[PDB]
């Protein structure tokens, strides 16, 4: 497995008119899956990270938007990165997106981090495009290899004991951080409970406490929940993704929670910007925006 060769070929199409494919060999991709999976299992399921760090939300197979973000923020290892999940589905190049991300995780395991999103789950990505892309360009056995790798992704991260990061949000079952550490891998995403919620929940302005989620899974949670949570755990900010927002990032509960969404013009159905959030060594956060076409 020649990792630098793989990364070279993945980056080769930078500047090519968006949409040009990179076709690695099946063994190369299987190698990326198996090695990154080993690394995920060797590192905590609740990551504890230090700034400076750049944080990205949903990418959803928009490979060329990923390259634009890296181009501006600096290609690993120029800057440290944390991604909040949802690498595949919806977009046209899930494969190039997840391969490059896994390659960087393997090459720079202490400086590059990936959380699990609700689309890193076979029953979701079976339906929303990743299975189809694998079947078309490779075979469904490779898809099952991806699933085994996704099943080992870490679930949340705390940056400098102040920013709690996860893909979806809070859970009525989340009483102590140690509970996240009890989650066992490899695992699929259950249809309820703490793990489900961390990947599926949403904030909601009109709910006091916990409410029903129109998604038909998990919950919504209000500003008061966010406040009591931050106070109890001595945190300053929840940073999550999972929902498309017009300006790429969007605050909630007077800046106690931010939503990050990094895929501009999502699905070619929305006119949203994408955003990445940079956190410097003092924990001063700034936003870098990819405006829609």
């Amino acid at each position: 497995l020649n990792l630098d060769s793989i990364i070279g070929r993945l980056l080769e199409v930078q500047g090519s008119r968006p949409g040009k494919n990179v076709q690695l060999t099946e063994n190369e991709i299987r190698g990326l899956c198996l090695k990154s999976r080993e690394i995920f299992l060797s590192q905590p399921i609740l990551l504890e990270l230090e700034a400076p760090l750049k944080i990205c939300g949903d990418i959803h197979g928009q490979y060329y938007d990923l390259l634009r973000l890296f181009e501006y923020g600096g290609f690993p290892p120029e800057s440290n990165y944390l991604f909040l999940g949802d690498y595949v589905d919806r977009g046209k190049q899930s494969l190039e997106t997840i391969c490059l991300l896994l390659a960087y995780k393997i090459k720079y395991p202490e400086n590059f981090f990936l959380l699990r999103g609700n689309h890193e789950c076979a029953s979701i990505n079976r339906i929303y495009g990743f299975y189809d892309e694998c079947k078309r360009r490779y075979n469904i056995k490779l898809w099952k290899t991806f699933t085994d790798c996704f099943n080992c992704l870490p679930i949340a991260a705390i940056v400098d004991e102040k920013i709690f990061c996860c893909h979806g949000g809070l859970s009525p079952d989340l009483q102590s951080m140690e509970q996240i550490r009890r989650i066992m891998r490899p695992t699929d995403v259950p249809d309820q409970g703490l793990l489900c919620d961390l990947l599926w929940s949403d904030p909601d302005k009109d709910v006091q406490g916990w409410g029903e989620n129109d998604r038909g899974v998990s919950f919504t949670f209000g500003a008061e929940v966010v406040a009591k949570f931050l106070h109890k755990h001595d945190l300053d900010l929840i940073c999550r993704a999972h929902q498309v927002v017009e300006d790429g990032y969007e605050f909630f509960a007077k800046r106690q929670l931010v939503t990050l969404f990094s895929a501009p013009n999502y699905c070619g159905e929305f006119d949203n910007a994408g955003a990445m959030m940079s956190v410097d060594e003092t924990l001063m956060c700034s936003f870098q925006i990819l405006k829609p076409a």
Partner: protein, 41 residues
């Protein structure tokens, strides 16, 4: 069913209910200005 599949299923079921019984025995700011990556759009 493979062993990996068996383990994954066992873990998935365990992960549905993580007990709250877990007994052992710098400040964030925001810059004023957003940076635009692709102003030519």
């Amino acid at each position: 069913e493979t062993e990996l599949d068996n383990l994954t299923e066992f873990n998935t079921a365990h992960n549905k209910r993580i007990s709250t019984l877990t007994i052992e025995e710098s400040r964030v700011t925001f810059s004023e200005d957003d940076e635009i990556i692709n102003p030519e759009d």
